[PDB]
Amino acid sequence: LPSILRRVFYRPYLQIFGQIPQEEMDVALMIPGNCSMERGSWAHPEGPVA
Amino acid sequence: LYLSDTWNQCDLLALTCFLLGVGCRLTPGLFDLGRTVLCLDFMIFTLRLLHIFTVNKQLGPKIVIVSKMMKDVFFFLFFLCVWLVAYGVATEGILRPQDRSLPSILRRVFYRPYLQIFGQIPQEEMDVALMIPGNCSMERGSWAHPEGPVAGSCVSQYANWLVVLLLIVFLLVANILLLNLLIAMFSYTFSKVHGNSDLYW
Amino acid sequence: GSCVSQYANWLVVLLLIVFLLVANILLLNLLIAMFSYTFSKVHGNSDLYW
Amino acid sequence: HIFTVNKQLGPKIVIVSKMMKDVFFFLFFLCVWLVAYGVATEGILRPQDRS
Amino acid sequence: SKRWSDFWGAPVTAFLGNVVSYLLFLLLFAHVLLVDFQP
């Protein structure tokens, strides 16, 4: 629950002030991987809370 | 009449600092002091070049209106420095860094919240969730270890959400209230002054 | 630079504070004030000329 | 220059060229202050790579 | 003696020569303070 509250309310707030994490939300700046036991493509971002 | 002025006090100041710089430079024990004072003197000789161009038609009256904005700037610095003390000491207090030198505290109280106005926001220095924990303190409580040589060697984890909430409130008041109210005061003062500054030029 | 001096470094930090004050506060906000003044002064004659 | 015939975008493109005297004041005050800060900071520091 | 004297006799070219000479002073002061400053 607080990790979702961070990624919904706290990260888009800091994007007004020029804090734009591209590596947390764009696959092309990331590496792929078999990181989910589920159907579909998945990829692995950088950051402890991302 | 020569001492009553301001730009003759400026041109006097550039040559006092010049002779102080050379006078230290030729002594064998003060080489670094003379090189530093000459490097401060170059700015004064460069700022003289604004007064030279006041005779031009296009750049003339605008350079006249530059000096009449400093009362609005001094209000901005008053409201800023009060709010910068308040945010700085509260955030330095809720966190408990272990490196507690006097100039390291002065950096983390006055210098780091100053650069957060200009978009320099270190999150990894002041948020536990972007850090790794550790047994870095011989003391009771939770502790964690941030990144950076001057960010304090070991910081506290208790009630960290209030530090994040002070970061949101600081960016709201500083980067929205103070800056946009400063643009509004420059707009008002410029239209109030522009007539008399053209007559005076 | 491969190697830099440590003598009187606090004056370098203090010049960084003064530079950000004059450039990012005086010059930019005085430029917005001059664009506001000039735009309201000119807007009538530019509509007639267009 | 092609789109100056349009109604909505027309007069605004006309007013763009009349702002350059304010921009040239900005560059004058900037370039003086940029020389002063630049050479003083490059002087107090002493870098060894001096190309 | 007159056309030469009435080009350089104006206050404009005295101003312009004052600026160019002062810019060369700043260029020299930077060349000393950045390149060859011997201990």
Tab-separated table of C-alpha atoms in Angstrom:
chain	number	residue	atom	x	y	z
A	1	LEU	CA	0.000	0.000	0.000
A	2	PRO	CA	2.593	2.757	0.775
A	3	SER	CA	4.650	1.838	-2.285
A	4	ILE	CA	1.607	2.426	-4.475
A	5	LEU	CA	0.934	5.712	-2.656
A	6	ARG	CA	4.505	6.762	-3.411
A	7	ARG	CA	4.285	5.911	-7.102
A	8	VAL	CA	0.893	7.578	-7.536
A	9	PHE	CA	1.118	10.780	-5.510
A	10	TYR	CA	4.756	11.435	-4.724
A	11	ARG	CA	6.576	10.781	-7.985
A	12	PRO	CA	4.289	12.858	-10.297
A	13	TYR	CA	4.547	15.685	-7.775
A	14	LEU	CA	8.309	15.869	-8.162
A	15	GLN	CA	8.051	15.801	-11.955
A	16	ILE	CA	6.851	19.408	-11.831
A	17	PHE	CA	10.150	20.441	-10.270
A	18	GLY	CA	12.335	18.779	-12.882
A	19	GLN	CA	12.780	15.409	-11.165
A	20	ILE	CA	11.901	13.087	-14.038
A	21	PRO	CA	12.873	9.419	-13.603
A	22	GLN	CA	12.886	7.944	-17.086
A	23	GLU	CA	14.520	4.671	-16.074
A	24	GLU	CA	11.669	3.900	-13.674
A	25	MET	CA	8.916	4.131	-16.274
A	26	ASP	CA	10.320	3.409	-19.762
A	27	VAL	CA	11.244	-0.084	-20.981
A	28	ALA	CA	13.692	1.117	-23.653
A	29	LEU	CA	16.015	2.457	-20.934
A	30	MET	CA	15.708	-0.827	-19.025
A	31	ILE	CA	16.766	-4.445	-19.445
A	32	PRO	CA	14.200	-7.204	-20.048
A	33	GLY	CA	13.872	-10.347	-17.971
A	34	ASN	CA	11.717	-13.286	-16.939
A	35	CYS	CA	10.841	-11.546	-13.692
A	36	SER	CA	7.170	-12.576	-13.468
A	37	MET	CA	5.442	-15.951	-13.240
A	38	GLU	CA	2.651	-14.701	-15.461
A	39	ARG	CA	1.725	-14.371	-19.117
A	40	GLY	CA	3.175	-11.426	-21.045
A	41	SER	CA	6.402	-9.510	-21.471
A	42	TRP	CA	8.082	-8.145	-18.371
A	43	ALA	CA	11.103	-5.990	-17.623
A	44	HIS	CA	13.203	-5.012	-14.618
A	45	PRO	CA	13.734	-1.340	-13.670
A	46	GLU	CA	16.311	0.453	-11.539
A	47	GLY	CA	15.485	1.586	-8.026
A	48	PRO	CA	14.488	0.012	-4.718
A	49	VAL	CA	10.933	1.407	-4.686
A	50	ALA	CA	10.266	1.523	-8.455
B	1	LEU	CA	32.323	65.270	-4.567
B	2	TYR	CA	34.612	62.407	-5.581
B	3	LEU	CA	33.950	60.416	-2.407
B	4	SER	CA	30.213	61.168	-2.342
B	5	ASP	CA	29.609	59.068	-5.491
B	6	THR	CA	29.162	55.297	-5.936
B	7	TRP	CA	30.943	54.332	-9.158
B	8	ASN	CA	34.007	56.345	-8.235
B	9	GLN	CA	33.944	54.366	-5.001
B	10	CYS	CA	33.781	51.294	-7.240
B	11	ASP	CA	36.723	52.364	-9.416
B	12	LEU	CA	38.613	53.269	-6.250
B	13	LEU	CA	37.836	49.793	-4.873
B	14	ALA	CA	39.283	48.001	-7.907
B	15	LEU	CA	42.670	49.637	-7.412
B	16	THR	CA	42.797	49.132	-3.654
B	17	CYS	CA	42.196	45.425	-4.265
B	18	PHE	CA	44.734	45.489	-7.093
B	19	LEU	CA	47.535	46.903	-4.948
B	20	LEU	CA	46.575	44.578	-2.101
B	21	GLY	CA	46.789	41.657	-4.513
B	22	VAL	CA	50.183	42.557	-5.964
B	23	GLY	CA	51.512	43.540	-2.544
B	24	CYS	CA	50.708	40.082	-1.225
B	25	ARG	CA	51.879	38.409	-4.443
B	26	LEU	CA	55.470	39.633	-4.346
B	27	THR	CA	55.921	38.571	-0.722
B	28	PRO	CA	57.191	34.975	-0.536
B	29	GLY	CA	54.817	33.870	2.198
B	30	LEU	CA	51.538	35.042	0.673
B	31	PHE	CA	51.362	33.693	-2.879
B	32	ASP	CA	47.953	32.045	-2.525
B	33	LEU	CA	46.419	35.118	-0.881
B	34	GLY	CA	47.587	37.341	-3.721
B	35	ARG	CA	46.252	35.019	-6.412
B	36	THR	CA	42.869	34.832	-4.671
B	37	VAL	CA	42.572	38.619	-4.266
B	38	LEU	CA	43.411	39.163	-7.938
B	39	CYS	CA	40.678	36.673	-8.854
B	40	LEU	CA	38.205	38.700	-6.822
B	41	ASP	CA	39.481	41.869	-8.462
B	42	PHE	CA	38.634	40.699	-11.982
B	43	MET	CA	34.927	40.725	-11.167
B	44	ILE	CA	35.095	44.363	-10.092
B	45	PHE	CA	36.886	45.393	-13.276
B	46	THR	CA	34.218	43.503	-15.217
B	47	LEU	CA	31.278	45.121	-13.423
B	48	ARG	CA	32.725	48.541	-14.332
B	49	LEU	CA	31.791	47.690	-17.930
B	50	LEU	CA	28.080	48.037	-17.138
B	51	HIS	CA	28.560	51.683	-16.226
B	52	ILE	CA	30.457	52.390	-19.449
B	53	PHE	CA	27.517	51.314	-21.629
B	54	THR	CA	24.949	53.615	-20.021
B	55	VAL	CA	25.551	56.213	-22.744
B	56	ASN	CA	24.147	53.928	-25.470
B	57	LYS	CA	20.582	54.490	-26.654
B	58	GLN	CA	19.344	50.894	-26.755
B	59	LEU	CA	20.980	49.510	-23.610
B	60	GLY	CA	20.963	52.759	-21.632
B	61	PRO	CA	17.654	53.141	-19.789
B	62	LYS	CA	17.370	49.417	-19.082
B	63	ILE	CA	20.636	49.442	-17.097
B	64	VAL	CA	19.157	52.380	-15.189
B	65	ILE	CA	16.094	50.329	-14.168
B	66	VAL	CA	18.233	47.392	-12.920
B	67	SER	CA	19.230	49.089	-9.653
B	68	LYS	CA	15.642	49.946	-8.668
B	69	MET	CA	14.661	46.279	-8.305
B	70	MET	CA	16.822	45.534	-5.290
B	71	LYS	CA	14.158	46.403	-2.731
B	72	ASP	CA	11.993	43.616	-4.124
B	73	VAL	CA	14.986	41.265	-4.095
B	74	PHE	CA	15.702	42.106	-0.459
B	75	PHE	CA	12.138	41.226	0.469
B	76	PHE	CA	12.625	37.907	-1.327
B	77	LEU	CA	15.789	37.185	0.641
B	78	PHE	CA	14.100	38.040	3.926
B	79	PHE	CA	11.184	35.685	3.366
B	80	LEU	CA	13.544	33.043	2.001
B	81	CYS	CA	16.133	33.129	4.794
B	82	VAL	CA	13.467	32.869	7.492
B	83	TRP	CA	11.838	29.906	5.757
B	84	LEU	CA	15.239	28.366	4.971
B	85	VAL	CA	16.269	28.408	8.626
B	86	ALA	CA	12.962	26.809	9.633
B	87	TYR	CA	13.021	23.966	7.101
B	88	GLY	CA	16.758	23.475	7.499
B	89	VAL	CA	16.999	23.027	11.254
B	90	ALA	CA	13.813	20.960	11.460
B	91	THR	CA	14.999	18.494	8.813
B	92	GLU	CA	18.500	18.355	10.298
B	93	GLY	CA	16.857	17.682	13.664
B	94	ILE	CA	14.432	14.884	12.765
B	95	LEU	CA	17.250	13.115	10.997
B	96	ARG	CA	20.170	12.418	13.324
B	97	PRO	CA	23.425	12.328	11.369
B	98	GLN	CA	26.473	10.963	13.125
B	99	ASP	CA	29.097	13.136	11.428
B	100	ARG	CA	28.470	16.251	13.493
B	101	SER	CA	31.182	18.733	12.591
B	102	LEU	CA	30.214	22.375	12.732
B	103	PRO	CA	30.728	23.133	8.978
B	104	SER	CA	29.024	19.886	7.975
B	105	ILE	CA	25.927	20.952	9.890
B	106	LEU	CA	26.127	24.410	8.291
B	107	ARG	CA	26.222	22.735	4.884
B	108	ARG	CA	23.219	20.520	5.566
B	109	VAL	CA	21.162	23.348	7.063
B	110	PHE	CA	21.861	26.342	4.838
B	111	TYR	CA	23.471	25.104	1.651
B	112	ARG	CA	21.421	22.071	0.655
B	113	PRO	CA	17.920	23.652	1.027
B	114	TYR	CA	19.200	26.613	-0.976
B	115	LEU	CA	19.989	24.425	-3.963
B	116	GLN	CA	16.603	22.707	-3.761
B	117	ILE	CA	15.035	25.867	-5.184
B	118	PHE	CA	17.080	25.444	-8.350
B	119	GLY	CA	16.079	21.842	-8.964
B	120	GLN	CA	18.936	20.149	-7.101
B	121	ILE	CA	16.971	17.711	-4.956
B	122	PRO	CA	18.980	14.907	-3.316
B	123	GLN	CA	16.455	12.239	-2.404
B	124	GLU	CA	19.039	9.603	-1.517
B	125	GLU	CA	20.517	11.846	1.178
B	126	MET	CA	17.279	12.311	3.098
B	127	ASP	CA	14.922	9.361	2.462
B	128	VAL	CA	15.401	5.909	4.010
B	129	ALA	CA	13.402	4.052	1.340
B	130	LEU	CA	16.044	4.942	-1.269
B	131	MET	CA	18.801	3.825	1.111
B	132	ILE	CA	20.068	0.596	2.646
B	133	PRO	CA	19.716	-0.096	6.382
B	134	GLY	CA	22.563	-1.026	8.689
B	135	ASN	CA	23.841	-1.287	12.246
B	136	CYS	CA	25.787	1.934	11.819
B	137	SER	CA	25.189	3.423	15.285
B	138	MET	CA	26.052	2.242	18.789
B	139	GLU	CA	22.768	3.595	20.083
B	140	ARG	CA	19.146	2.587	20.535
B	141	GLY	CA	16.857	2.822	17.504
B	142	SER	CA	16.820	2.081	13.801
B	143	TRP	CA	19.583	3.533	11.667
B	144	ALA	CA	20.424	3.632	7.979
B	145	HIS	CA	23.377	4.542	5.777
B	146	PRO	CA	23.059	7.162	3.001
B	147	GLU	CA	25.103	7.931	-0.101
B	148	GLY	CA	27.517	10.842	-0.170
B	149	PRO	CA	30.669	11.934	1.643
B	150	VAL	CA	29.068	14.896	3.446
B	151	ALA	CA	25.506	13.544	3.841
B	152	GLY	CA	26.253	12.171	7.316
B	153	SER	CA	27.617	8.708	7.858
B	154	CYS	CA	24.534	7.197	9.511
B	155	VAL	CA	21.040	8.621	9.801
B	156	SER	CA	17.885	7.798	11.739
B	157	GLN	CA	14.776	6.043	10.447
B	158	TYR	CA	12.245	7.186	13.047
B	159	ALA	CA	9.310	9.179	11.619
B	160	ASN	CA	10.824	9.584	8.175
B	161	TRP	CA	7.484	10.381	6.525
B	162	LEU	CA	7.554	13.766	8.235
B	163	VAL	CA	10.853	14.496	6.486
B	164	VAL	CA	9.274	13.643	3.132
B	165	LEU	CA	6.265	15.783	4.031
B	166	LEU	CA	8.510	18.722	4.894
B	167	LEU	CA	10.152	18.339	1.489
B	168	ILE	CA	6.762	18.663	-0.207
B	169	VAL	CA	5.789	21.722	1.844
B	170	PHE	CA	9.150	23.406	1.221
B	171	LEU	CA	8.955	22.968	-2.550
B	172	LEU	CA	5.401	24.314	-2.474
B	173	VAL	CA	6.162	27.506	-0.565
B	174	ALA	CA	9.579	28.249	-2.065
B	175	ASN	CA	9.155	27.244	-5.699
B	176	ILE	CA	5.553	28.476	-6.095
B	177	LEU	CA	4.708	31.234	-3.612
B	178	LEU	CA	8.006	33.077	-3.345
B	179	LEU	CA	9.126	32.904	-6.959
B	180	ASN	CA	5.806	33.754	-8.556
B	181	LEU	CA	5.116	36.529	-6.070
B	182	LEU	CA	8.525	37.894	-6.986
B	183	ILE	CA	7.602	37.965	-10.683
B	184	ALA	CA	4.407	39.819	-9.779
B	185	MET	CA	6.341	42.418	-7.791
B	186	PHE	CA	8.831	42.934	-10.610
B	187	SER	CA	5.956	43.470	-13.040
B	188	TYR	CA	4.283	46.008	-10.767
B	189	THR	CA	7.457	47.929	-9.950
B	190	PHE	CA	8.611	48.026	-13.576
B	191	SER	CA	5.424	49.639	-14.822
B	192	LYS	CA	5.422	52.053	-11.882
B	193	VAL	CA	9.021	53.202	-12.384
B	194	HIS	CA	9.544	53.151	-16.175
B	195	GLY	CA	8.385	56.733	-16.781
B	196	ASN	CA	10.647	58.441	-14.259
B	197	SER	CA	13.604	56.301	-15.264
B	198	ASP	CA	13.298	57.462	-18.862
B	199	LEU	CA	13.141	61.104	-17.753
B	200	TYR	CA	16.123	60.633	-15.469
B	201	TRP	CA	18.174	58.959	-18.197
C	1	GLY	CA	40.600	19.235	-15.082
C	2	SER	CA	42.753	16.398	-13.870
C	3	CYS	CA	43.765	17.918	-10.526
C	4	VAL	CA	42.400	20.988	-8.784
C	5	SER	CA	43.395	23.145	-5.829
C	6	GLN	CA	41.904	23.105	-2.337
C	7	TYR	CA	42.972	26.548	-1.125
C	8	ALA	CA	40.071	28.861	-0.195
C	9	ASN	CA	37.382	26.628	-1.646
C	10	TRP	CA	34.588	28.259	0.363
C	11	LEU	CA	34.896	31.313	-1.866
C	12	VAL	CA	34.147	29.100	-4.869
C	13	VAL	CA	31.008	27.813	-3.149
C	14	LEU	CA	30.072	31.380	-2.234
C	15	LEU	CA	30.487	32.500	-5.840
C	16	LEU	CA	28.159	29.683	-6.877
C	17	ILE	CA	25.477	31.004	-4.524
C	18	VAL	CA	25.870	34.592	-5.745
C	19	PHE	CA	25.785	33.524	-9.401
C	20	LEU	CA	22.572	31.532	-9.008
C	21	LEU	CA	21.026	34.482	-7.173
C	22	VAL	CA	21.797	37.109	-9.802
C	23	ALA	CA	21.299	34.960	-12.900
C	24	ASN	CA	18.336	32.783	-11.964
C	25	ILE	CA	16.402	35.456	-10.023
C	26	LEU	CA	17.323	38.975	-11.142
C	27	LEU	CA	17.943	38.478	-14.845
C	28	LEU	CA	15.189	35.996	-15.623
C	29	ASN	CA	12.428	37.677	-13.663
C	30	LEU	CA	13.394	41.123	-14.910
C	31	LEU	CA	13.182	39.675	-18.400
C	32	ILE	CA	9.619	38.473	-17.780
C	33	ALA	CA	8.733	41.957	-16.540
C	34	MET	CA	10.158	43.561	-19.677
C	35	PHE	CA	8.289	41.150	-21.936
C	36	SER	CA	5.052	41.970	-20.120
C	37	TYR	CA	5.603	45.710	-20.466
C	38	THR	CA	6.639	45.597	-24.120
C	39	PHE	CA	3.787	43.273	-25.100
C	40	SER	CA	1.103	45.561	-23.732
C	41	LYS	CA	2.815	48.592	-25.263
C	42	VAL	CA	3.106	47.090	-28.753
C	43	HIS	CA	-0.037	44.942	-29.158
C	44	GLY	CA	-2.223	47.713	-30.602
C	45	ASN	CA	0.096	48.790	-33.406
C	46	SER	CA	0.921	45.201	-34.283
C	47	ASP	CA	-2.751	44.429	-34.839
C	48	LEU	CA	-3.135	47.496	-37.068
C	49	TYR	CA	-0.016	46.589	-39.010
C	50	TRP	CA	-1.157	42.998	-39.514
D	1	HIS	CA	6.484	33.188	-42.689
D	2	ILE	CA	4.003	31.045	-44.625
D	3	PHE	CA	1.543	30.940	-41.711
D	4	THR	CA	1.313	34.707	-41.231
D	5	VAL	CA	-1.819	34.806	-43.400
D	6	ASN	CA	-3.837	32.759	-40.879
D	7	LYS	CA	-6.210	34.583	-38.540
D	8	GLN	CA	-5.400	32.819	-35.268
D	9	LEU	CA	-1.623	32.472	-35.584
D	10	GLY	CA	-1.060	35.612	-37.656
D	11	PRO	CA	-0.630	38.622	-35.364
D	12	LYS	CA	1.237	36.620	-32.728
D	13	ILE	CA	4.007	35.743	-35.211
D	14	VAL	CA	4.158	39.466	-35.969
D	15	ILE	CA	4.817	40.308	-32.296
D	16	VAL	CA	7.646	37.725	-32.009
D	17	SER	CA	10.221	39.868	-33.834
D	18	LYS	CA	9.638	42.942	-31.647
D	19	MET	CA	10.961	41.208	-28.519
D	20	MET	CA	14.562	40.930	-29.652
D	21	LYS	CA	15.650	44.246	-28.159
D	22	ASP	CA	14.741	42.930	-24.719
D	23	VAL	CA	16.560	39.675	-25.474
D	24	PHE	CA	19.677	41.575	-26.527
D	25	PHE	CA	19.675	43.445	-23.233
D	26	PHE	CA	19.446	40.079	-21.471
D	27	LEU	CA	22.437	38.748	-23.393
D	28	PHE	CA	24.477	41.852	-22.626
D	29	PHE	CA	23.906	41.649	-18.886
D	30	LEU	CA	24.406	37.887	-18.985
D	31	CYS	CA	27.647	37.822	-20.983
D	32	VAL	CA	29.262	40.445	-18.756
D	33	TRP	CA	28.286	38.544	-15.614
D	34	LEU	CA	29.229	35.212	-17.214
D	35	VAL	CA	32.749	36.409	-17.987
D	36	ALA	CA	33.157	37.687	-14.423
D	37	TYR	CA	31.975	34.530	-12.651
D	38	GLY	CA	33.687	32.280	-15.175
D	39	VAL	CA	37.219	33.643	-15.028
D	40	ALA	CA	37.131	34.153	-11.262
D	41	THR	CA	36.070	30.559	-10.593
D	42	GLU	CA	38.534	29.198	-13.154
D	43	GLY	CA	41.208	31.288	-11.431
D	44	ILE	CA	40.655	30.347	-7.781
D	45	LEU	CA	40.633	26.720	-8.798
D	46	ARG	CA	43.852	25.718	-10.548
D	47	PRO	CA	43.202	22.880	-12.988
D	48	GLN	CA	46.202	21.084	-14.407
D	49	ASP	CA	44.765	20.247	-17.830
D	50	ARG	CA	45.260	23.683	-19.350
D	51	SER	CA	44.438	23.385	-23.033
E	1	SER	CA	44.724	67.175	-41.395
E	2	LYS	CA	40.998	67.915	-41.337
E	3	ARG	CA	39.156	64.800	-42.540
E	4	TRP	CA	41.468	62.626	-40.439
E	5	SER	CA	40.958	64.963	-37.507
E	6	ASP	CA	37.171	64.983	-37.914
E	7	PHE	CA	36.879	61.226	-37.840
E	8	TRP	CA	38.818	60.834	-34.594
E	9	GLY	CA	37.532	64.086	-33.116
E	10	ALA	CA	33.997	62.890	-32.525
E	11	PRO	CA	32.982	61.674	-29.057
E	12	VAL	CA	31.793	58.403	-30.601
E	13	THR	CA	35.203	57.123	-31.677
E	14	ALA	CA	36.639	58.190	-28.337
E	15	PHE	CA	33.975	56.037	-26.683
E	16	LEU	CA	34.602	53.157	-29.071
E	17	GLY	CA	38.347	53.325	-28.552
E	18	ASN	CA	37.714	53.442	-24.813
E	19	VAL	CA	35.681	50.227	-24.995
E	20	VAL	CA	38.117	48.330	-27.247
E	21	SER	CA	41.090	49.289	-25.095
E	22	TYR	CA	39.222	48.275	-21.942
E	23	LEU	CA	38.246	44.894	-23.418
E	24	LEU	CA	41.894	44.251	-24.255
E	25	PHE	CA	42.751	45.051	-20.649
E	26	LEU	CA	40.354	42.339	-19.494
E	27	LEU	CA	41.747	39.893	-22.050
E	28	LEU	CA	45.273	40.503	-20.779
E	29	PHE	CA	44.156	40.204	-17.150
E	30	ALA	CA	42.620	36.813	-17.922
E	31	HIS	CA	45.689	35.629	-19.854
E	32	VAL	CA	47.847	36.417	-16.835
E	33	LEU	CA	45.501	34.989	-14.247
E	34	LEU	CA	44.741	31.732	-16.086
E	35	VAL	CA	47.780	30.730	-18.142
E	36	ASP	CA	51.102	32.150	-16.917
E	37	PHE	CA	50.974	33.039	-13.209
E	38	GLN	CA	54.411	32.110	-11.916
E	39	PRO	CA	55.129	31.620	-8.196
